[PDB]
Write a protein that binds this ligand. Structure first.
Ligand SMILES: *C[C@@H]1C(=O)C2CCN1CC2
Ligand SMILES: *C[C@@H]1C(=O)C2CCN1CC2
Ligand SMILES: *C[C@@H]1C(=O)C2CCN1CC2
Ligand SMILES: *C[C@@H]1C(=O)C2CCN1CC2
Ligand SMILES: *C[C@@H]1C(=O)C2CCN1CC2
Ligand SMILES: *C[C@@H]1C(=O)C2CCN1CC2
Ligand SMILES: *C[C@H]1C(=O)C2CCN1CC2
Ligand SMILES: *C[C@H]1C(=O)C2CCN1CC2
Ligand SMILES: [Zn+2]
Ligand SMILES: [Zn+2]
Ligand SMILES: [Zn+2]
Ligand SMILES: [Zn+2]
Lengths: 191, 189, 187, 191
């Protein structure tokens, strides 16, 4: 069972999220009170990476989903049989993988040989000129309600910073809810 | 014994029914308080499919009847001997038919022997918010050699083109001559 | 064409009554005899009393239906606005008028007029029977009533649907019924 | 692009009230009716009362936003100074000038098109017996902060909005944040 313990590590690795509000039309929104991201099926979910000092070149950024409830934590999070069916829009990603990265041609996907867990990794890139953080656009490819997939079970996304050799540099996590109206879901859950 | 657990699933699948009232002339009427449809032998029984987003083409909608009481739940629901003795498409033993759909498909489960009927899912028409399937029940709830006054539950399942279950809902049915009167009388309790 | 609004006391002497609630700031609903008009709040209890001179037979029913008062809008179906349509597990989301606290309530979408109504069994009483109506839209709801006055028509029907009596009253749904009634009665 | 500051009592008779705190030396906040101007200390409670003629619909929300008062600064976004905006933040974004204290349902917005900051809380009707609702605001920079407001006067705009975001009411007041509100109010009223 993968570790979810927060670790800023030596580079001061933290996650940030846009302050999007909860209007009805918002496509994603993060709740600080719940440390919970609310996003829509296969739509952009921006995650910011904040560091104290720049990690070495070749540093990588990995995302992995796990079930939040301890009696489900041993089950690998995957797409439901319905959505895992191949389509013409899978592109670079394995059809079973819940978490994709959008807009990064150097994305890499892993089925772990021993643990069978899915993850997606991209190169760490420093913020652009005039920016203080690096943003990754994740996509979640099932709904929280999917029968035969997550099946209403809550999940966490674990983001790890690792060096080119795979050693842990830092780790942080957040809960994710994938549904049609993130603004309403967040406003209702905070109530 | 097939599952009856309600799941809206990824597409927000739920059932809806016309608000038909209980006047004498009504040939079908649904009771929200009882989650129970009252309809007439071999007459139109419209069931609406409501979804929060559109399932892809190839999606299918299956209906199956089971007995509601656990004493009878392992017995296959079928027409009585009298009413078996068609439309050319439906097996004579099946209680539930779909009318007005040339793409209807009927299944005798090879292992459980249960009957079901399945049509392609079609999205709502222009201006409508739901898809309607016209079911026909081919036996009276009181048919001696069939249901014999035992209550039944109709299970509606949404499945994708590969057979994966997408969602499920159900309702009780009562088939008899005067649906309006039967719904009024049963709601007095 | 438009459903009849003409008063009819019928064989049972059917009339409506309303509480004499006054117009204090606290009142959640109040009826104006001078305007034959009920002032109530969104989704809150709006009590209507049924008065009869003799008891209707068992199986008698009581229907409520909203119609626009002005001749220019009389043929348009009164419905909830799109906002409020987006509850109780029994009422259709498009219906403006609900009945609260009656598990035997029945809702009708008329197959040919498309008009909405809500019906409950008539129960004998007290010296009157009370039905708690809820109005699920404001009178000013854009895309719904949109500041067009409505009437509620109350009909008494036998078990076979024959009319036994009919009465009506105007309805205004807004935030402060006491203030609204006092203001409208001033002018 | 500049938000409206036009006072709009709207259909519910929306008005702002303030405590009658006086100008003693030790007062931590004080409002000047003559100036329609609040004087408060950095990061200290600033009570603002909401008064309505009739109770707004369930799901109503109350938004606060700061803008510069002078015409030649009105297009600049009001934000915290670099010194103060360094990451006690709790639920609030570090760049936001205005926080709400003591409300776990608070929501912060970075407008995606205008880039302006605001903070929104649910409208709660007054408790049975009370005539008004109070929100506790905190201003997280001084008026004098170099790089931040940099001695420029600001207005706070309070908007009442329905659950869908439609304008129900608007009011505003000037704000001066400094160490001794009593002395600053008394002195500014001397002129
Ligand atoms: C953290 C970075 C920035 O500096 C701005 C706002 C959010 N990201 C991208 C642009
Ligand atoms: C659900 C749909 C609609 O939108 C109307 C009423 C019932 N069906 C067909 C037409
Ligand atoms: C319920 C059924 C019917 O449809 C008629 C009346 C009573 N039974 C037998 C015949
Ligand atoms: C008609 C009945 C009564 O007997 C009184 C007045 C109104 N309702 C309830 C109390
Ligand atoms: C009648 C209605 C209300 O409830 C408020 C005040 C006046 N109109 C519009 C909003
Ligand atoms: C005017 C209205 C009312 O009728 C009650 C008391 C004061 N406001 C809000 C609810
Ligand atoms: C659809 C299926 C294939 O045909 C290959 C590509 C994607 N998926 C696994 C192997
Ligand atoms: C509305 C305001 C008052 O009038 C006092 C009681 C409640 N609130 C604070 C002081
Ligand atoms: Zn899925
Ligand atoms: Zn039969
Ligand atoms: Zn409305
Ligand atoms: Zn500062």
């Amino acid at each position: 069972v993968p570790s979810q313990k927060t670790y800023q590590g030596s580079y001061g690795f933290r996650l940030g999220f846009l302050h999007s509000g909860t209007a009805k039309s918002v496509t994603c929104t993060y709740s600080p009170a719940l440390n919970k991201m609310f996003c829509q099926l296969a739509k952009t979910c921006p995650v910011q990476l904040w560091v104290d000092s720049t990690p070495p070149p070749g540093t990588r950024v990995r995302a992995m989903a796990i079930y939040k409830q301890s009696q489900h934590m041993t089950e690998v999070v995957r797409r439901c049989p319905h959505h895992e069916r191949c389509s013409d829009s899978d592109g670079l990603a394995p059809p079973q993988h819940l978490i994709r990265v959008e807009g990064n041609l150097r994305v890499e996907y892993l089925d772990d040989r021993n643990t069978f867990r899915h993850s997606v990794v991209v190169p760490y890139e420093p913020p652009e000129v005039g920016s203080d953080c690096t943003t990754i656009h994740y996509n979640y490819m099932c709904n929280s309600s999917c029968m035969g997939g997550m099946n209403r079970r809550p999940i966490l996304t674990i983001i790890t910073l690792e060096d080119s050799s795979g050693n842990l540099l830092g780790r942080n996590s957040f809960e994710v809810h994938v549904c049609a109206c993130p603004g309403r879901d967040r406003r209702t859950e905070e109530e």
